[PDB]
Amino acid sequence: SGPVPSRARVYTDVNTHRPSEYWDYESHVVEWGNQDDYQLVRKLGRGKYSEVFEAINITNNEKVVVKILKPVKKKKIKREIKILENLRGGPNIITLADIVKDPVSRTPALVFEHVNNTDFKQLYQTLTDYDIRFYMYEILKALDYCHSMGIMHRDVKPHNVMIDHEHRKLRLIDWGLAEFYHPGQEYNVRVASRYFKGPELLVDYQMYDYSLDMWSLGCMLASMIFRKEPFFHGHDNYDQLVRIAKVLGTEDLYDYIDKYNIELDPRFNDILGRHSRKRWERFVHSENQHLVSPEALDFLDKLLRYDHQSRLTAREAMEHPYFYTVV
């Protein structure tokens, strides 16, 4: 007949009960600030259709971040702007401070609050079991917030989590892939970065929800506690699912596709194979045992599940025993 419909177990109808003003980002009126208020200092990085710069707001001598967008698609820019304005002030959500335009090049730029990112490659060795529990909890505060506001981030990964370790400040950045959750809507599966992509995306199941973010979060936690970057190392989108199946096993994959009447792409036939369900304890080694505990393993087991409906919600995750040591 076709695939079985699905819906989020929490915050299902938050957008349904809100005016069109909230979620109709295409109708949203954007108002430009003064580009001249900002002096570009240095290039921070380069994205798909963006160039990120450290800058100074010369009207208050304050450091800011300017993300210049290659205006490839207007609807996309408007969606990012609306979502950022809706979530502004939310816990651990990057604060959009201004929106500016370069008249000569005819290029939009989003201006954010500055975050001093502490070096990731130097964090990895010194970091403790407590530090992982603490920053995991800070990310879930950002997720429970944006999901309660009817938004899925759809690009949760270490590059999109900024940390100022000195001040124990975390921010969830780059809301360029984020979308308003409407029950029953069929979304584009070309979202998230390969390693972080949930099985729903890999099997082309379009009626996904907030729970997509909880899978990406589980990939990050597995990678941190096991010191294995990335945890699921696919070489392409079909291989990515094969890497998951090498961990979760192929039996539960068939239970997932059957439950939702998903048509597996024929490209999966020769590469899928047969895989047994692995124990999480098998990934424990001398290099990572100080970060691993039974609470961490029970928590991870509750996030990394094929069935999107069966994953912990951000709020259920915050109530898990893994976070009993955090405030």
Ligand SMILES: CC(=O)NCCCNCc1ccc(-c2ccccc2)c(Cl)c1
């Ligand atoms: C734009 C830009 O400069 N990005 C830099 C990305 C910086 N990433 C560093 C980092 C460090 C720790 C974690 C983490 C993960 C799981 C639990 C606890 C902490 C994550 Cl997700 C990311």
Ligand SMILES: Cc1ccc(O)c(C(=O)O)c1
């Ligand atoms: C602070 C900061 C740095 C880089 C970025 O790309 C963003 C963002 O996308 O929101 C934010």
